[PDB]
């Protein structure tokens, strides 16, 4: 009846083609702002002094980049963790020089993806669903917050956040390895277990379901037309898939309950990505990967190398050349 | 459900099984222990002991460079 | 009291969910877990004392509880030197014995008490739907929390004081005689930006500010406790919130996640409530120490540190912050908001003063900077100090690093717990936590999206 | 090879005197080096001042030369500058100032002897001893 | 080599203990399959 | 009732587990090798 | 009863461990490969091939052990135990790195036997062989990485070592020497693997949160039986949810599961094509337009050129230790390094 209640009913409506909700009332402005500023900056931002040493890095397409090398360059190291909106700049050109677009895009994007997770819960509540899809989405959200927010906070500068580009991401990863030895960190190893196993189990699940499809089509048409949207019955024989997979390994290694199988399919890469998000978030505070350098000595005391020592030689080569003009003192304290 | 074999939970909860294994599993453990502690593993696999990584006449890495006569090469490397 | 899944509908891996409507057993689980917390406090303090070299810095020895006891002003003197081993041992012994008492009480309520307390007393009997009794328990816990804040205030004001790292003559255990009761300062700490140079409440820089805030927190908590004991929840609160045990758990999980994040940032950035004599330098402190150390060394070699330009054109040792303050050069330009008791003597109104740098640097500041630079919070998981490219000979990870990493991980997983329990509480109060009813599936009655 | 006596034989003074450490003395000197020296002298460098490192050429170029046991012991009692002109008792860790360096007030004279012996033996076990910070 | 003797002999003790505690049923299973 | 003892499953278990326990005892003795 | 059909009966019994005709290839080869890896990482050095300690016997841990690649002097010699290098000596064979082609060859033939096992059990059970088709991805990865990459290079030395930190070395080596992150074939591999992980997580979460209320317990896992006919979760509700959240949604179960198959298998095949290119040093190392500009203009810096500098530094600081057979003496003054580090 009231205007506010009519607005509340429109906002929370399940009949909206794209669900808005109250989390969407924050999601849509922040994500549209971040999208518009990212597109404009990726095409036409001027070079950005990321290291705060008056050495501006061309990040945009109009300044000589391609798609692979293009990036929205992180804000200046001179700024650090300081809040740098447009109204704190004396001009828009100064804001562009110091990397203000990165701060704007990253802050609105982080709010938007947290509101995406809230909106996923919201729509699951309005649809009468169980609510934990947002918990699975909290693993990419945690990883994004680790590389765009938590690593800058721990390192003390938004210039340390992952750049918004392909080659910028590669640069972030290589400097990360040289400084934190992320490959030797077990949380990253758990993340690699998560993504390799998630892809493995995606291939397994998909291959077993495709293998055990019930014959409902001819050999001419696509087999996907054997499934009708909203059909009551099962489109594949789970018992046949279980018989195959419990003969492929052994009987008790195969799921027969589809709900336990799908909980495992959800839980494995989510827990792996949670662990790798926490690994990056803890190397924000410089709790680094394992240091086994010169761990093996002979009886005289001479160092016998291992593969970790060769890995350290690679890490040193990455470190001495990174931000080549930014260091004035002997130690890269942060 | 059962393919024919005795179920494992029946097997490992038996007196006769643990009478056999209380002996077999620790004595395999001590067999591996005496493989290492008598030093036979070094001679079997050619792994240097902690004082034969470098000799008094070779202090560099003994990187094999021969393609066929590697036995004499390892010998003069010691 | 169902102790199996046919009698409860909860599997063993969700088995403590069988305790939701069993109040006395639930009280026993809590008291038993509380006893675990006090047990760790006592046994870890005894371990840290047993693994304490008192002539060695606490941050060098992997200690996290002895710094907390020393910050309160127990067993320490000027510059954090341990005068007495005994107060740390006393704090450990007291927690360990109280934990024995609490474990006996938790095991009693969990295994022999009334399973439900509502058939024994109306005071301890709680129904989750009973909004008045849950607000009474809020009020009790609020009164005792305010008393704990006032107990910290009493320790700092009337019981020997606390460790002030900013004290003249160097940091020492001093008595706070003039805490700031000004609500402008205390609550404008809450309005400061959570960003660089402002730091929200992490930038609280003096023991007077901390103690005045704790007086305000104690007053606020006691007033709010008397509030929740004297009032029922209002209609807006009843219409906005879910009123169930899982809901209240998830609300507390969200608060705990917030507090773990804040504690990680607090131990990473603040050196007032986490003094660097006990917790080691912060990352910002160590970087500024490296810049100051090499400024001092190159000035002793005759270099003009003001007019020295670096390879990039900025000053090698001294430069300007984006607002113009004279700050250390190099990558530490990002840490220019760092304040520390070894560095504030060399800071003028415009930043780092040239005259003080030229002729007022003391040898203890040089020693402190070298120690802090060589104890930067950088370390491998296996506790190998320094940058990760260093070889294995320095057994060090800063307590700041351990505490910040642990509490950030705990804060994240407790945000995950909030999401899991807030969603399940809403789904269970709405009635679809077990899945979609086939006959009344809600999407089947909606119009098509296109 | 083993940790031979030739590895433990090091110059004792400036006059050609030599001393041979024991295995226990070398182990104790290493342990003391891990405990107190490595925070600035990891792998023989000096993070605070790598112009003055623990390399053997660095030790030989000091005034007087610090490539022998008694010179390193004297530096650990009364540290000086590299040219021996200035006083570093308030700036380098030492055993004569327990007021400002309490981490070494429980070290005896034999402990200083052991850590000096390790400081002379460790350069011939690592070729990157006393190099650049990143080496 | 005495090393070979003292390495093989624990395996011999394990095998002979398993044999003298399973051999009746082992010979029975061998008989029932011919 | 009256199961076989020696099966393909028995050999499948030992082929893996007998050298596994042997190798574990080896690595346990390796833990006490001094430099 | 013919002897072949009697053997076919015995090989394809319903036992705890299925053998099959494929088991005669799979089980001895997989056992040889696994036992060789465990034997090498427990006992066998890399001191004469690499100048490294890589067994538990030398004091390395689980991260730092490997069956390391053989010496570069052997080229692509298959390094048989009876071969002209080892000459029957097992100790010499262990020392020259013959366990690497032992593990790699038996592993490759065991992988063949495993996909043959997938084919055999799929035929016996009566299902389609899409598990074997999906497993073509891992075999493509193994063949391109452990076999055709060293075959294209100078020796088996530059193959990845069968170890955790050895694989990390191979990974960093391919970054610094090949710019393998910049290769689009690896980017498609990354997209496929992260998409497969995404699809796994999203598919599991969607099914667990669109389950039908088919039981009275809060434990929803007991509301399923394998022999039931109807779906355990609501595809209509899931479709409406993802249509309103994401914009699009799956409407076909079979297409959903084929896509869950398709994404990581295609990623593995694409990354394998890139590794085949890298075998011949056919890299996507450089964008020549940006180097020509950067050589002409010292004001031009992108993240690409920074990565190029990172690769140069890694190569110069790693190659003397990573390739000790080359005797790379790089004096300290030629090592590229930035200011003060
Ligand atoms: C619903 C709630 C919505 C709330 C929204 C409000 C924003 C929340 C997020 C804040 C993000 C801030 C970005 C910049 C952070 C920063 O510059 O730094 C952190 C700041 C602290 O600021 C620092 O504070 C310092 C204060 O120390 C000063 O004072 C000290 C006194 O001892 C010392 O003297 C010290 O040397 C001196 O510098 C300095 O001022 C620094 O310059 C300044 O940067 O944190 C703080 O204020 C408070 C802590 C912030 C939150 C911590 C992150 C939580 C992340 C969770 C991620 C979850 C993911 C889940 C996924 C699923
Ligand atoms: C599908 C899935 C099923 C999976 C199956 C897995 C099991 C596979 C079983 C086979 C394994 C292949 C072993 C290949 C051995 C090999 O290659 O060994 C290599 C030899 C050639 O030897 C090499 O030859 C080189 C060139 O030498 C020549 O040049 C030199 C310099 O001038 C000298 O003059 C020298 O004397 C002269 O011979 C160098 O000498 C090398 O050191 C030496 O190792 O070829 C040969 O045996 C035979 C060459 C022809 C057949 C090649 C088949 C393999 C294809 C390789 C593709 C190569 C490159 C593309 C990469 C991408
Ligand atoms: C902090 C950890 C903690 C605590 C305090 C509890 C507490 C409780 N759980 Mg529980 N649980 C936990 C972790 C915990 N759990 C974990 C990690 C799991 C997953 C495996 C479970 C799964 C679970 C299930 C399935 C159930 C419970 C149940 C219970 C309740 C009664 C237990 C009972 O009756 O059987 C008694 C058990 C014993 C008598 C075994 C002996 C154990 C004793 C108590 C050991 C501790 C004694 C200590 C050494 C002595 C110190 C005392 C002093 C002298 C110093 C109880 C309040 C039950 C319930 O819901 O109640 C209706 C139940 O069904 N839990
Ligand atoms: C949060 C903790 C907590 C809570 C809410 C309860 C609640 C209850 N207990 Mg329990 N108990 C606890 C912890 C707790 N207990 C611990 C730690 C022990 C070990 C000593 C016990 C051992 C215990 C036994 C043996 C019995 C109970 C009983 C009871 C019930 C009636 C008590 C009563 O009203 O008498 C009146 C209350 C008073 C006279 C208040 C006296 C003040 C207290 C005891 C001293 C002050 C505490 C401390 C010094 C102050 C600060 C705490 C410190 C750790 C900081 C009641 C529901 C009885 C029962 O089972 O019900 C039928 C029963 O016989 N409890
Ligand atoms: C931890 C102790 C505690 C707990 C569990 C509660 C719990 C509760 N209080 Mg209480 N309160 C407390 C302490 C506590 N209070 C104290 C210490 C005081 C003294 C100041 C009060 C004074 C108080 C009053 C006057 C009222 C309550 C009310 C309530 C009820 C509903 C509140 C609500 O909906 O939240 C949510 C709040 C909102 C939706 C309002 C918007 C607030 C914005 C979003 C906060 C912004 C915070 C920001 C994101 C974080 C930045 C930090 C800083 C800048 C603020 C609830 C049961 C209400 C009630 O029901 O009466 C009985 C009520 O009117 N409390
Ligand atoms: C104090 C806060 C708190 C409390 C009281 C609860 C309480 C409850 N939770 Mg919750 N939850 C929390 C925080 C909390 N949770 C957090 C922080 C998370 C995110 C991880 C979750 C995620 C969660 C899930 C997914 C579920 C619950 C569930 C439950 C219910 C039953 C759980 C149970 O029986 O324990 C059983 C304990 C175990 C089975 C063992 C857990 C051990 C974990 C996996 C590893 C331990 C790691 C630890 C750091 C030690 C490392 C060991 C290592 C060295 C080997 C119960 C009422 C269930 C539910 O919804 O029912 C209503 C359920 O499904 N919770
Ligand atoms: C007690 C452990 C809880 C830790 C949280 C991790 C489990 C949840 C992760 C799933 C995320 C995806 C969300 C959508 C997925 C989703 O919606 O799940 C649905 C699934 C169905 O549960 P039910 O509704 O039947 O029961 C759960 C509650 O409703 C009441 O029991 O929930 C669970 O299975 C929870 C069981 C977790 C308890 C055991 C899990 C232990 C795994 C972690 C062990 C440690 C791993 C690291 C070791 C190296
Ligand atoms: C319910 C339940 C549970 C739980 C339980 C718990 C949680 C508990 C606890 C408990 C506790 C919480 C405890 C405790 C304790 C303590 C004690 C018992 C102590 C003591 C003492 C002493 C004796 C000491 C001594 C000493 C001193 C005096 C000092 C010096 C040193 C020493 C140490 C000698 C579970 C999970 C199992 C499950 C089932 C049910
Ligand atoms: C001690 C101290 C201090 C003080 C502090 C203070 C004084 C404080 C406070 C504080 C406070 C006083 C706070 C707070 C908070 C709040 C919160 C955290 C909230 C919230 C929220 C919520 C939870 C809500 C929700 C919702 C919404 C959003 C809407 C609808 C409904 C609902 C409910 C859903 C200082 C720093 C000075 C100094 C140092 C120390
Ligand atoms: C090379 C070769 C060969 C072969 C051999 C073989 C085939 C053998 C073997 C072997 C084997 C087959 C061995 C084994 C092993 C093992 C081990 C070394 C194990 C382990 C383990 C562990 C350590 C685990 C742990 C854990 C975890 C981590 C998880 C859960 C829990 C537990 C604790 C269980 C022949 C003579 C033909 C000729 C020449 C060449
Ligand atoms: C700070 C918040 C101050 C409280 C403001 C609300 C006071 C209103 C008193 O009224 C209370 O709440 C609502 C009005 O919304 C009524 O509905 C409830 O029956 C009553 O308990
Ligand atoms: C976990 C698996 C265990 C690994 C196996 C343990 C035994 C390893 C080998 C050690 C045995 C003796 O070690 C070495 O064996 C080889 C056989 O390979 C002998 O070699 C001898 O026979 C071979 C075979 O014709 C020829 O090379 C030659 O005639 C002669 O050298 C060596 O003289 C001996 O030094
Ligand atoms: Ca020290
Ligand atoms: Cl760079
Ligand atoms: Cl610097
Ligand atoms: Fe599925």
UniProtKB/Swiss-Prot annotation, chain A:
Single GO BP term: photosynthetic electron transport in photosystem II
Cellular compartments per GO CC: plasma membrane-derived thylakoid membrane; plasma membrane-derived thylakoid photosystem II
Cytoplasmic face of the membrane: 1-21, 125-132, 209-260
Cofactor remark from the record: The D1/D2 heterodimer binds P680, chlorophylls that are the primary electron donor of PSII, and subsequent electron acceptors. It shares a non-heme iron and each subunit binds pheophytin, quinone, additional chlorophylls, carotenoids and lipids. D1 provides most of the ligands for the Mn4-Ca-O5 cluster of the oxygen-evolving complex (OEC). There is also a Cl(-1) ion associated with D1 and D2, which is required for oxygen evolution. The PSII complex binds additional chlorophylls, carotenoids and specific lipids.
Amino acids binding chlorophyll a PD1: 188
InterPro entries in UniProt: D1/D2, Photo_II_D1/D2_sf, Photo_RC_L/M, Photo_RC_L/M_CS, PSII_D1
Highest taxon of source: Bacteria
Chain sites annotated for binding Fe cation: 205, 262
Residues that hold [CaMn4O5] cluster according to the record: 160, 179, 322-323, 327, 332, 334
Impact after mutating residue 227 to F: Weak herbicide resistance
Subcellular location, record wording: Cellular thylakoid membrane
Effect the entry attributes to changing residue 245 to W: Herbicide resistance
Listed transmembrane segments: 22-43, 101-124, 133-151, 182-208, 261-285
Keyword Transmembrane helix among UniProt keywords: yes
Residue ranges, Lumenal, thylakoid side: 44-100, 152-181, 286-334
Catalytic reaction(s) noted: 2 a plastoquinone + 4 hnu + 2 H2O = 2 a plastoquinol + O2
Amino-acid positions noted as binding a quinone in the UniProt annotation, renumbered to this chain: 205, 254-255
Membrane topology, as annotated: Multi-pass membrane protein
A matching Pfam family: Photo_RC
Family named by the database record: Belongs to the reaction center PufL/M/PsbA/D family.
Note: Cyanobacteria usually contain more than 2 copies of the psbA gene. 2 of the reaction center chlorophylls (ChlD1 and ChlD2) are entirely coordinated by water.
Swiss-Prot record, chain D:
GO molecular function: electron transfer activity; heme binding; iron ion binding
Family membership noted in the UniProt record: Belongs to the cytochrome c family. PsbV subfamily.
Superkingdom of origin organism: Bacteria
Residues the entry annotates as binding heme c: 37, 40-41, 92
GO terms for biological process, alphabetical: photosynthesis, light reaction; respiratory electron transport chain
Organism placement in taxonomy: Bacteria, Bacillati, Cyanobacteriota, Cyanophyceae, Synechococcales
Subunit field text: PSII is composed of 1 copy each of membrane proteins PsbA, PsbB, PsbC, PsbD, PsbE, PsbF, PsbH, PsbI, PsbJ, PsbK, PsbL, PsbM, PsbT, PsbX, PsbY, PsbZ, Psb30/Ycf12, peripheral proteins PsbO, CyanoQ (PsbQ), PsbU, PsbV and a large number of cofactors. It forms dimeric complexes. The cyanobacterial oxygen-evolving complex is composed of PsbO, CyanoQ (PsbQ), PsbV and PsbU.
Protein topology in the membrane: Peripheral membrane protein
UniProt-recorded name of the protein: Photosystem II extrinsic protein V
GO annotation, cellular component aspect: plasma membrane-derived thylakoid membrane; plasma membrane-derived thylakoid photosystem II
Species for this entry: Synechocystis sp. (strain ATCC 27184 / PCC 6803 / Kazusa)
Keywords: Electron transport, Heme, Iron, Membrane, Metal-binding, Photosynthesis, Photosystem II, Signal, Thylakoid, Transport
Encoding gene per record: psbV
UniProtKB/Swiss-Prot annotation, chain F:
One GO term of the biological process aspect: photosynthetic electron transport chain
Organism lineage string: Bacteria, Bacillati, Cyanobacteriota, Cyanophyceae, Synechococcales
Biological source species: Synechocystis sp. (strain ATCC 27184 / PCC 6803 / Kazusa)
Example of a GO cellular component annotation carried by this entry: photosystem II reaction center
Parts of the chain that traverse the membrane: 8-32
Name of the protein in its database record: Cytochrome b559 subunit beta
Location relative to the cell: Cellular thylakoid membrane
Residues bound to heme: 9, 14
Gene: psbF
Needed co-factor(s): heme b
GO molecular function, one term: electron transfer activity
Swiss-Prot record, chain G:
InterPro entries per the UniProt record, alphabetical: D1/D2, Photo_II_D1/D2_sf, Photo_RC_L/M, Photo_RC_L/M_CS, PSII_PsbD/D2
GO cellular component: photosystem II; plasma membrane-derived thylakoid membrane; plasma membrane-derived thylakoid photosystem II
Regions that span the bilayer: 21-42, 98-120, 130-151, 180-206, 255-277
Native source species: Synechocystis sp. (strain ATCC 27184 / PCC 6803 / Kazusa)
Gene behind the chain: psbD
Positions with a binding annotation for Fe cation: 203, 257
First-tier enzyme category under EC: oxidoreductase
Function statement: Photosystem II (PSII) is a light-driven water:plastoquinone oxidoreductase that uses light energy to abstract electrons from H(2)O, generating O(2) and a proton gradient subsequently used for ATP formation. It consists of a core antenna complex that captures photons, and an electron transfer chain that converts photonic excitation into a charge separation. The D1/D2 (PsbA/PsbD) reaction center heterodimer binds P680, the primary electron donor of PSII as well as several subsequent electron acceptors. D2 is needed for assembly of a stable PSII complex.
Enzyme Commission designation: 1.10.3.9
Other remarks on this protein: 2 of the reaction center chlorophylls (ChlD1 and ChlD2) are entirely coordinated by water.
Binding, chlorophyll a PD2: 186
Entry's family note: Belongs to the reaction center PufL/M/PsbA/D family.
Cytoplasmic side: 1-20, 121-129, 207-254
Pfam family, one: Photo_RC
Catalytic activity, reaction form: 2 a plastoquinone + 4 hnu + 2 H2O = 2 a plastoquinol + O2
Residues the entry annotates as binding chlorophyll a ChlzD2: 106
Protein topology in the membrane: Multi-pass membrane protein
SUPFAM superfamilies given in the database record: Bacterial photosystem II reaction centre, L and M subunits
Protein name: Photosystem II D2 protein
Subcellular compartments: Cellular thylakoid membrane
């Amino acid at each position: 009846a009231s205007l506010w209640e009519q607005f509340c009913q429109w906002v929370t409506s399940t009949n909206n083609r794209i669900y808005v909700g109250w989390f969407g009332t924050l999601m849509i402005p922040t994500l549209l702002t971040a999208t518009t500023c990212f597109i404009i900056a990726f095409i036409a931002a001027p070079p950005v002094d990321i290291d705060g040493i008056r050495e501006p890095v061309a990040g945009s397409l109009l300044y000589g980049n391609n798609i692979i090398s293009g990036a929205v360059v992180p804000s200046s190291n001179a700024i650090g963790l300081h809040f740098y909106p447009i109204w704190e700049a004396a001009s828009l050109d100064e804001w562009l020089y110091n990397g203000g677009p990165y701060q704007l895009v990253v802050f609105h994007f982080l709010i938007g993806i947290f509101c995406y997770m809230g909106r996923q819960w919201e729509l699951s509540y309005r649809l009468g669903m169980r609510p934990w899809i947002c918990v699975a989405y909290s693993a990419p959200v945690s990883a994004a917050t680790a590389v765009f927010l938590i690593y800058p906070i721990g390192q003390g500068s938004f210039s340390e956040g992952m750049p918004l580009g392909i080659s910028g991401t590669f640069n972030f990863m290589i400097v990360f390895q040289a400084e934190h030895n992320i490959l030797m960190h077990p949380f990253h190893m758990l993340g690699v277990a998560g993504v390799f196993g998630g892809s493995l189990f995606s291939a397994m699940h998909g291959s077993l379901v495709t293998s055990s499809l019930v014959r409902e089509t001819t050999e001419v048409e696509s087999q996907n037309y054997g499934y009708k949207f909203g059909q009551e019955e099962e489109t594949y024989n789970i018992v046949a898939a279980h018989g195959y997979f419990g003969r492929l390994i052994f009987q008790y290694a195969s799921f027969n309950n589809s709900r336990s199988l799908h909980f495992f399919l959800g839980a494995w890469p989510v827990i792996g990505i949670w662990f790798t998000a926490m690994g990056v978030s803890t190397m924000a505070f410089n709790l680094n990967g394992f240091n086994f350098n010169q761990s093996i000595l002979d009886s005289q005391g001479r160092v016998i190398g291992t593969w970790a020592d060769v890995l350290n030689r690679a890490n040193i080569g990455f470190e001495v050349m990174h931000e080549r003009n930014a260091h004035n003192f002997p130690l890269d304290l942060a | 459900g059962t393919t024919g074999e005795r179920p494992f939970s029946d097997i490992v909860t038996s007196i006769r099984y643990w009478v056999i294994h209380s002996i077999t599993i620790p004595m395999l453990f001590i067999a591996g222990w005496l493989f290492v502690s008598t030093g036979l593993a070094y001679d079997a696999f050619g792994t240097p002991r902690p004082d034969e990584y470098f000799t008094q006449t070779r202090q560099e890495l003994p990187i094999l460079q021969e393609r066929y006569d590697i036995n004499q090469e390892i010998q003069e490397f010691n | 009291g169902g102790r199996d899944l046919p009698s409860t509908g909860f599997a063993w891996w969700s088995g403590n969910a069988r305790l939701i409507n069993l109040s006395g057993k639930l009280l026993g689980a809590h008291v038993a877990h509380a006893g675990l917390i006090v047990f760790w406090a006592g046994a870890m303090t005894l371990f840290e004392v047993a693994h304490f070299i008192p002539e060695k810095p606490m941050y060098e020895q992997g200690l996290i509880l002895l710094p907390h006891i020393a910050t309160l002003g127990w067993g320490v003197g000027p510059a954090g030197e341990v005068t007495d081993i005994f107060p740390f041992f006393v704090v450990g012994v007291l927690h360990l014995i109280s934990s024995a008492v609490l474990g006996l009480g938790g095991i009693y309520h969990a295994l022999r008490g009334p399973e439900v307390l509502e058939e024994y007393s109306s005071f301890f009997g709680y129904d989750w739907k009973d909004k008045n009794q849950m607000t009474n328990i809020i009020g009790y816990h609020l009164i005792l929390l305010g008393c704990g804040a006032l107990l910290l205030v009493f320790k700092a004001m009337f019981f020997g004081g606390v460790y002030d790292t900013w004290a003249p003559g160097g940091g020492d255990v001093r008595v706070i005689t003039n805490p700031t009761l000004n609500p402008a300062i205390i609550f404008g700490y809450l309005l400061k930006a959570p960003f660089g140079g402002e730091g929200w409440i992490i930038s609280v820089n003096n023991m007077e500010d901390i103690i005045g805030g704790h007086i305000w927190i104690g007053l606020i908590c006691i007033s709010g406790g008397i509030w929740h004991i004297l009032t029922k929840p209002f209609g807006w609160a009843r219409r906005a919130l879910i009123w169930s045990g899982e809901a209240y758990l998830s609300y507390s999980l969200g608060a705990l996640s917030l507090m773990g994040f804040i504690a990680s940032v607090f131990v990473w950035f603040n050196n007032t409530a986490y003094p660097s004599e006990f917790y080691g330098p912060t990352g910002m402190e160590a970087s500024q120490s490296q810049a100051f150390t090499f400024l001092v060394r190159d000035q002793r070699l005759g270099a003009n540190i003001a007019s020295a330009q670096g390879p990039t054109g900025l000053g090698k040792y001294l430069m300007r912050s984006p607002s113009g303050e004279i700050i250390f050069g190099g990558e530490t330009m990002r840490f220019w908001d760092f304040r520390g008791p070894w560095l504030e003597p060399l800071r003028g109104p415009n930043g780092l003063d040239l005259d003080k740098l030229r002729n007022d640097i003391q040898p203890w500041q040089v020693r402190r900077a070298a120690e802090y630079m060589t104890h930067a919070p950088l370390g491998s998981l296996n506790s190998v100090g320094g940058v990760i490219t260093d070889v294995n000979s320095f057994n060090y990870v800063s307590p700041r690093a351990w505490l910040a990493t642990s509490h950030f991980v705990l804060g994240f997983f407790f945000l995950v717990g909030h999401l899991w329990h807030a969603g399940r509480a809403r789904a269970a109060a709405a009635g679809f936590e077990k899945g979609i009813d086939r006959e009344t599936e809600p999407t089947l009655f909606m119009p098509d999206l296109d | 090879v083993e940790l031979t006596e030739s590895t433990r034989t090091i110059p004792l003074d400036e006059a050609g005197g030599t001393t041979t450490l024991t295995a226990r003395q070398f182990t104790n000197g290493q342990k003391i080096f891990v405990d107190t020296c490595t925070q600035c002298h990891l792998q023989g460098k000096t993070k605070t001042n790598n112009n003055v490192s623990l390399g053997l050429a660095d030790l030989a170029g000091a005034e007087p030369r610090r490539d022998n046991v008694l010179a390193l012991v004297e530096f650990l009692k009364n540290p000086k500058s590299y040219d021996g002109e200035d006083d570093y008792s308030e700036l380098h860790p030492n055993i004569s100032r327990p007021d400002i360096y309490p981490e070494m007030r429980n070290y005896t004279e034999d402990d200083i002897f052991d850590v000096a012996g390790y400081t002379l033996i460790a350069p011939k076990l690592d070729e990157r001893w006393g190099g650049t910070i990143y080496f | 080599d005495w090393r070979v003797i003292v390495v093989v002999s624990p395996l011999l003790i394990a095998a002979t203990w398993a044999a003298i505690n399973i051999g009746a049923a082992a010979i029975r299973q061998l008989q029932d399959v011919l | 009732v009256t199961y076989p003892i020696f099966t393909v499953r028995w050999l499948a278990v030992h082929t893996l587990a007998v050298p596994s326990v042997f190798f574990v005892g080896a690595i346990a003795a390796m833990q006490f090798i001094q430099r | 009863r013919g002897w072949f059909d009697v053997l076919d009966d015995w090989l394809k019994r319903d036992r705890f461990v299925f053998i099959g005709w494929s088991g005669l290839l799979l089980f001895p080869c997989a056992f040889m490969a696994l036992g060789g890896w465990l034997t090498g990482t427990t006992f066998v050095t890399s001191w004469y091939t690499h100048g490294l300690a890589s067994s538990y016997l030398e004091g390395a841990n689980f991260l730092t052990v490997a069956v390391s690649s053989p010496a570069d002097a052997f080229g692509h010699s298959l390094l048989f135990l009876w071969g002209p290098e080892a000459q029957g000596n097992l100790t010499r064979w262990f020392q020259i790195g013959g366990l690497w082609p032992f593990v790699a060859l038996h592993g490759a033939f065991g992988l063949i036997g495993f996909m043959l096992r997938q084919f055999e059990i799929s035929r016996l059970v009566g299902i389609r062989p899409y598990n074997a088709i999906a497993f073509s991805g891992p075999i493509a990865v193994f063949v391109s990485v452990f076999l055709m990459y060293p075959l294209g290079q100078s020796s088996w030395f530059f193959a990845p070592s069968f170890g955790v930190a050895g694989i990390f070395r191979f990974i960093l080596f391919l970054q610094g020497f090949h710019n393998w992150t910049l290769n689009p074939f690896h980017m498609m591999g990354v997209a496929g693997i992260l998409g497969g992980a995404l699809l796994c997580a999203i598919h599991g979460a969607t099914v667990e949160n669109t389950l039908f209320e088919d039981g009275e317990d809060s434990n929803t896992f007991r509301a399923f039986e394998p022999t039931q006919a109807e779906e355990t979760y609501s595809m209509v509700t899931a479709n409406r949810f993802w249509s309103q959240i994401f914009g699009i949604a799956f409407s076909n179960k079979r297409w959903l599961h084929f896509f869950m198959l398709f994404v990581p298998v295609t990623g593995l095949w694409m990354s394998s094509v890139g590794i085949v290119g890298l075998a011949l040093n056919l890299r996507a190392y450089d964008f020549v337009s940006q180097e020509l500009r950067a050589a002409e203009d010292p004001e031009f810096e992108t993240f690409y050129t920074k990565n190029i500098l990172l690769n140069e530094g890694m190569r110069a600081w790693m190659a003397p230790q990573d390739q000790p057979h080359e005797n790379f003496i790089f004096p300290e003054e030629v090592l590229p390094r930035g200011n003060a580090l």
